[PDB]
Protein backbone atom coordinates (compact mmCIF):
# COMPACT_ATOMS: atom_id res chain seq x y z
CA UNK A 1 0.00 0.00 0.00
CA UNK A 2 2.94 2.33 -0.65
CA UNK A 3 1.06 4.02 -3.51
CA UNK A 4 -1.92 4.31 -1.16
CA UNK A 5 0.27 5.83 1.58
CA UNK A 6 1.89 8.38 -0.73
CA UNK A 7 -1.56 9.24 -2.10
CA UNK A 8 -2.83 9.96 1.43
CA UNK A 9 0.37 11.97 2.06
CA UNK A 10 -0.14 14.08 -1.08
CA UNK A 11 -3.86 14.43 -0.24
CA UNK A 12 -3.16 15.87 3.22
CA UNK A 13 -0.27 18.02 1.95
CA UNK A 14 -2.35 19.51 -0.87
CA UNK A 15 -5.33 19.91 1.49
CA UNK A 16 -3.20 22.00 3.86
CA UNK A 17 -1.56 24.06 1.12
CA UNK A 18 -4.98 24.70 -0.48
CA UNK A 19 -6.25 25.75 2.95
CA UNK A 20 -3.37 28.24 2.96
CA UNK A 21 -4.08 29.46 -0.60
CA UNK A 22 -7.82 29.92 0.00
CA UNK A 23 -7.19 32.01 3.13
CA UNK A 24 -7.20 35.16 0.97
CA UNK A 25 -10.51 34.17 -0.64
CA UNK A 26 -12.15 33.10 2.63
CA UNK A 27 -11.30 36.29 4.57
CA UNK A 28 -13.10 38.54 1.99
CA UNK A 29 -9.99 38.70 -8.02
CA UNK A 30 -9.15 35.20 -6.77
CA UNK A 31 -11.86 33.53 -8.90
CA UNK A 32 -9.10 31.82 -10.91
CA UNK A 33 -8.04 30.05 -7.71
CA UNK A 34 -11.67 29.17 -6.93
CA UNK A 35 -12.32 27.33 -10.21
CA UNK A 36 -8.87 25.72 -9.89
CA UNK A 37 -9.79 24.50 -6.40
CA UNK A 38 -13.12 23.22 -7.76
CA UNK A 39 -11.28 21.32 -10.51
CA UNK A 40 -8.84 20.03 -7.86
CA UNK A 41 -11.58 18.72 -5.56
CA UNK A 42 -13.40 17.11 -8.53
CA UNK A 43 -10.08 15.51 -9.55
CA UNK A 44 -9.58 14.21 -6.00
CA UNK A 45 -13.14 12.83 -5.98
CA UNK A 46 -12.44 11.07 -9.30
CA UNK A 47 -9.11 9.72 -8.05
CA UNK A 48 -10.66 8.48 -4.78
CA UNK A 49 -13.32 6.74 -6.87
CA UNK A 50 -10.47 5.31 -8.98
CA UNK A 51 -8.97 3.78 -5.84
CA UNK A 52 -12.26 2.66 -4.28
CA UNK A 53 -11.80 3.97 10.47
CA UNK A 54 -11.16 7.07 12.57
CA UNK A 55 -8.73 10.00 12.80
CA UNK A 56 -6.64 8.58 15.68
CA UNK A 57 -5.90 5.30 13.86
CA UNK A 58 -5.74 6.35 10.20
CA UNK A 59 -5.01 10.08 9.71
CA UNK A 60 -2.57 10.23 12.61
CA UNK A 61 -0.18 7.65 11.08
CA UNK A 62 0.87 9.82 8.09
CA UNK A 63 2.21 12.60 10.31
CA UNK A 64 5.91 12.16 9.51
CA UNK A 65 5.74 12.18 5.70
CA UNK A 66 3.30 15.11 5.45
CA UNK A 67 5.31 16.97 8.08
CA UNK A 68 8.50 16.43 6.09
CA UNK A 69 6.72 18.09 3.15
CA UNK A 70 5.32 20.93 5.28
CA UNK A 71 7.16 21.37 8.66
CA UNK A 72 4.45 23.20 10.62
CA UNK A 73 2.70 21.21 13.36
CA UNK A 74 0.25 24.04 14.11
CA UNK A 75 -1.30 23.76 10.64
CA UNK A 76 -1.72 20.01 11.17
CA UNK A 77 -3.46 20.61 14.49
CA UNK A 78 -5.71 23.30 12.96
CA UNK A 79 -6.70 20.75 10.29
CA UNK A 80 -7.36 18.13 12.97
CA UNK A 81 -9.32 20.56 15.16
CA UNK A 82 -11.47 21.61 12.20
CA UNK A 83 -12.21 17.96 11.35
CA UNK A 84 -12.97 17.25 15.03
CA UNK A 85 -15.36 20.21 15.19
CA UNK A 86 -16.92 19.06 11.90
CA UNK A 87 -17.94 15.64 13.24
CA UNK A 88 -13.60 5.92 7.11
CA UNK A 89 -12.39 9.49 7.70
CA UNK A 90 -11.51 9.91 3.99
CA UNK A 91 -15.22 10.56 3.43
CA UNK A 92 -15.12 13.10 6.28
CA UNK A 93 -12.17 14.97 4.76
CA UNK A 94 -13.77 14.93 1.30
CA UNK A 95 -17.06 16.20 2.77
CA UNK A 96 -15.03 19.00 4.37
CA UNK A 97 -13.54 19.76 0.95
CA UNK A 98 -17.01 19.87 -0.64
CA UNK A 99 -18.30 22.19 2.09
CA UNK A 100 -15.33 24.53 1.67
CA UNK A 101 -15.60 24.32 -2.14
CA UNK A 102 -19.15 25.71 -2.27
CA UNK A 103 -18.26 28.65 -0.01
Amino acid at each position, epitope marked *: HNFFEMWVTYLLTETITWKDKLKTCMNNECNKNCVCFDKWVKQKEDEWNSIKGNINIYFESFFFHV*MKKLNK*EAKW*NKLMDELRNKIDAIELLLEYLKEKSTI
Partner: antibody
Amino acid sequence: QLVESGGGLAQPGGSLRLSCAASGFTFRDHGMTWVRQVSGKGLEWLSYITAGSKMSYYSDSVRGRFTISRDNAKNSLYLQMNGLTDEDSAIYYCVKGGGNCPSDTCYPSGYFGLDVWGQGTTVT
Amino acid sequence: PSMSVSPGQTAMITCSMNKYSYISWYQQRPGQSPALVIYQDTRRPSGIPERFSGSNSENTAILTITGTRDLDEADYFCQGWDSNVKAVLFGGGTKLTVL
Protein backbone atom coordinates in the same frame (compact mmCIF):
# COMPACT_ATOMS: atom_id res chain seq x y z
CA GLN B 1 13.43 -4.22 26.50
CA LEU B 2 16.59 -2.12 26.23
CA VAL B 3 19.89 -3.30 27.72
CA GLU B 4 22.93 -1.04 28.13
CA SER B 5 26.71 -1.23 28.45
CA GLY B 6 29.73 1.03 28.09
CA GLY B 7 29.32 3.55 30.92
CA GLY B 8 31.87 4.21 33.61
CA LEU B 9 34.64 6.70 34.33
CA ALA B 10 36.29 9.10 31.88
CA GLN B 11 39.03 11.67 32.23
CA PRO B 12 38.69 14.84 30.10
CA GLY B 13 39.41 13.95 26.51
CA GLY B 14 37.60 11.47 24.27
CA SER B 15 37.36 7.76 23.37
CA LEU B 16 34.38 6.55 25.40
CA ARG B 17 31.56 4.60 23.73
CA LEU B 18 28.25 3.39 25.14
CA SER B 19 26.08 0.61 23.72
CA CYS B 20 22.34 -0.08 23.78
CA ALA B 21 20.82 -3.27 22.35
CA ALA B 22 17.07 -3.58 21.75
CA SER B 23 15.60 -6.92 22.84
CA GLY B 24 12.12 -7.98 21.76
CA PHE B 25 11.39 -4.74 19.88
CA THR B 26 11.03 -3.92 16.19
CA PHE B 27 14.33 -2.05 15.91
CA ARG B 28 14.12 -1.83 12.11
CA ASP B 29 11.13 0.52 11.74
CA HIS B 30 11.35 2.64 14.92
CA GLY B 31 13.44 5.68 15.70
CA MET B 32 16.17 5.76 18.31
CA THR B 33 17.20 8.50 20.74
CA TRP B 34 19.76 9.23 23.45
CA VAL B 35 19.02 11.77 26.19
CA ARG B 36 21.41 12.61 29.00
CA GLN B 37 20.34 13.79 32.45
CA VAL B 38 22.58 15.43 35.04
CA SER B 39 21.66 14.08 38.48
CA GLY B 40 19.59 16.73 40.23
CA LYS B 41 18.84 18.45 36.90
CA GLY B 42 16.50 17.87 33.97
CA LEU B 43 16.64 16.02 30.67
CA GLU B 44 18.72 17.22 27.71
CA TRP B 45 18.37 15.65 24.27
CA LEU B 46 21.63 15.01 22.43
CA SER B 47 21.26 12.87 19.30
CA TYR B 48 18.58 11.22 17.17
CA ILE B 49 18.71 8.71 14.32
CA THR B 50 15.95 7.67 11.91
CA ALA B 51 14.75 4.20 10.95
CA GLY B 52 16.83 4.09 7.76
CA SER B 53 19.78 5.91 9.43
CA LYS B 54 20.00 8.45 6.58
CA MET B 55 19.04 11.50 8.69
CA SER B 56 20.33 12.50 12.11
CA TYR B 57 19.71 15.49 14.37
CA TYR B 58 21.88 16.92 17.14
CA SER B 59 21.75 19.67 19.74
CA ASP B 60 23.64 22.95 19.44
CA SER B 61 26.33 21.80 21.89
CA VAL B 62 26.91 18.24 20.63
CA ARG B 63 26.67 18.71 16.84
CA GLY B 64 29.82 17.33 15.21
CA ARG B 65 31.42 16.62 18.59
CA PHE B 66 29.37 13.43 19.07
CA THR B 67 28.42 10.78 16.52
CA ILE B 68 25.89 7.95 16.34
CA SER B 69 25.18 5.00 14.02
CA ARG B 70 22.92 1.94 14.24
CA ASP B 71 23.19 -1.73 13.29
CA ASN B 72 19.80 -3.07 12.20
CA ALA B 73 20.98 -6.71 12.25
CA LYS B 74 22.06 -7.13 15.89
CA ASN B 75 19.61 -4.35 16.95
CA SER B 76 22.32 -2.46 18.85
CA LEU B 77 22.82 1.32 18.85
CA TYR B 78 26.10 2.92 19.94
CA LEU B 79 26.91 6.46 21.06
CA GLN B 80 30.48 7.68 20.52
CA MET B 81 31.90 10.82 22.14
CA ASN B 82 34.98 13.00 21.84
CA GLY B 83 36.13 15.98 23.88
CA LEU B 84 34.41 15.14 27.17
CA THR B 85 34.38 17.81 29.88
CA ASP B 86 32.99 18.07 33.42
CA GLU B 87 29.51 19.10 32.24
CA ASP B 88 29.04 15.77 30.42
CA SER B 89 28.89 13.78 33.68
CA ALA B 90 25.27 12.68 33.29
CA ILE B 91 23.06 9.60 33.10
CA TYR B 92 22.76 8.63 29.43
CA TYR B 93 19.42 6.96 28.66
CA CYS B 94 19.10 5.12 25.36
CA VAL B 95 15.55 5.78 24.16
CA LYS B 96 13.38 4.12 21.53
CA GLY B 97 12.00 6.89 19.33
CA GLY B 98 8.22 6.76 19.37
CA GLY B 99 6.03 6.43 16.32
CA ASN B 100 6.02 4.23 13.25
CA CYS B 101 8.55 5.97 10.90
CA PRO B 102 7.20 5.92 7.32
CA SER B 103 10.47 5.33 5.40
CA ASP B 104 13.27 7.40 7.05
CA THR B 105 11.28 10.53 7.94
CA CYS B 106 11.81 10.23 11.70
CA TYR B 107 12.16 13.16 14.09
CA PRO B 108 11.73 13.17 17.91
CA SER B 109 8.60 15.25 18.25
CA GLY B 110 6.30 15.42 21.23
CA TYR B 111 3.61 14.19 18.85
CA PHE B 112 4.59 10.52 19.00
CA GLY B 113 6.81 11.15 22.01
CA LEU B 114 9.68 8.99 23.25
CA ASP B 115 7.84 5.93 24.52
CA VAL B 116 10.52 3.55 25.87
CA TRP B 117 13.44 4.73 28.01
CA GLY B 118 16.21 2.35 28.99
CA GLN B 119 17.79 2.13 32.42
CA GLY B 120 21.04 3.69 31.19
CA THR B 121 24.60 3.58 32.48
CA THR B 122 26.38 6.21 34.56
CA VAL B 123 29.02 8.34 32.81
CA THR B 124 31.33 10.16 35.21
CA PRO C 1 9.93 26.17 39.28
CA SER C 2 7.65 23.99 41.43
CA MET C 3 4.13 23.81 42.82
CA SER C 4 3.35 22.48 46.30
CA VAL C 5 0.07 20.67 45.60
CA SER C 6 -1.88 18.74 48.22
CA PRO C 7 -2.94 15.17 47.30
CA GLY C 8 -6.30 14.75 45.60
CA GLN C 9 -6.39 18.21 43.96
CA THR C 10 -5.60 19.41 40.44
CA ALA C 11 -2.08 20.46 39.41
CA MET C 12 -1.71 23.03 36.62
CA ILE C 13 1.77 22.62 35.12
CA THR C 14 2.43 25.14 32.34
CA CYS C 15 5.39 25.69 30.02
CA SER C 16 3.71 28.44 27.93
CA MET C 17 6.04 28.28 24.94
CA ASN C 18 5.15 30.86 22.30
CA LYS C 19 5.46 28.58 19.26
CA TYR C 20 2.96 25.73 19.06
CA SER C 21 4.21 22.15 19.02
CA TYR C 22 2.70 18.92 20.32
CA ILE C 23 3.68 18.68 23.99
CA SER C 24 4.47 15.36 25.66
CA TRP C 25 4.97 14.71 29.37
CA TYR C 26 7.12 12.30 31.37
CA GLN C 27 6.70 11.03 34.94
CA GLN C 28 10.28 10.64 36.20
CA ARG C 29 10.26 8.62 39.40
CA PRO C 30 13.39 9.41 41.48
CA GLY C 31 16.21 7.02 40.68
CA GLN C 32 14.16 5.72 37.74
CA SER C 33 13.99 6.38 34.01
CA PRO C 34 11.14 8.57 32.72
CA ALA C 35 8.14 7.04 30.99
CA LEU C 36 5.78 8.35 28.33
CA VAL C 37 2.49 9.61 29.78
CA ILE C 38 0.65 11.86 27.31
CA TYR C 39 1.37 12.18 23.58
CA GLN C 40 -0.28 14.13 20.71
CA ASP C 41 -1.56 16.50 23.50
CA THR C 42 -4.64 14.31 24.16
CA ARG C 43 -3.72 10.66 23.73
CA ARG C 44 -2.34 8.18 26.25
CA PRO C 45 -0.80 4.69 25.99
CA SER C 46 -2.20 1.57 27.60
CA GLY C 47 -0.95 0.67 31.07
CA ILE C 48 -1.36 4.13 32.65
CA PRO C 49 -4.74 5.20 34.13
CA GLU C 50 -7.12 7.83 32.76
CA ARG C 51 -6.32 10.43 35.45
CA PHE C 52 -3.48 12.01 33.43
CA SER C 53 -5.04 14.57 31.08
CA GLY C 54 -3.42 17.19 28.90
CA SER C 55 -4.16 20.01 26.49
CA ASN C 56 -2.35 22.82 24.71
CA SER C 57 -4.58 25.78 23.83
CA GLU C 58 -3.82 29.52 23.48
CA ASN C 59 -0.05 28.78 23.41
CA THR C 60 -0.09 27.16 26.86
CA ALA C 61 0.47 23.46 27.54
CA ILE C 62 -1.46 22.31 30.62
CA LEU C 63 -1.01 18.81 32.04
CA THR C 64 -4.18 18.41 34.11
CA ILE C 65 -3.47 15.76 36.75
CA THR C 66 -6.84 14.84 38.27
CA GLY C 67 -6.40 13.25 41.67
CA THR C 68 -2.71 13.72 42.41
CA ARG C 69 -1.26 10.74 44.29
CA ASP C 70 1.94 10.22 46.31
CA LEU C 71 3.18 8.16 43.32
CA ASP C 72 3.03 11.36 41.19
CA GLU C 73 6.19 12.82 42.78
CA ALA C 74 8.04 13.50 39.54
CA ASP C 75 9.61 16.15 37.34
CA TYR C 76 7.25 16.61 34.40
CA PHE C 77 8.98 17.81 31.23
CA CYS C 78 7.41 19.38 28.18
CA GLN C 79 8.55 17.85 24.90
CA GLY C 80 8.37 20.56 22.26
CA TRP C 81 9.74 20.75 18.71
CA ASP C 82 11.34 23.53 16.68
CA SER C 83 11.11 22.78 12.96
CA ASN C 84 13.30 25.80 12.13
CA VAL C 85 16.40 24.32 13.81
CA LYS C 86 15.27 20.63 13.87
CA ALA C 87 16.04 20.32 17.59
CA VAL C 88 13.55 19.18 20.22
CA LEU C 89 13.09 21.53 23.19
CA PHE C 90 12.71 19.68 26.49
CA GLY C 91 11.16 21.73 29.25
CA GLY C 92 12.94 22.61 32.46
CA GLY C 93 10.61 20.41 34.49
CA THR C 94 8.70 21.20 37.69
CA LYS C 95 9.27 19.36 40.97
CA LEU C 96 5.59 18.62 41.58
CA THR C 97 5.78 18.19 45.35
CA VAL C 98 3.06 15.94 46.78
CA LEU C 99 2.27 16.70 50.42
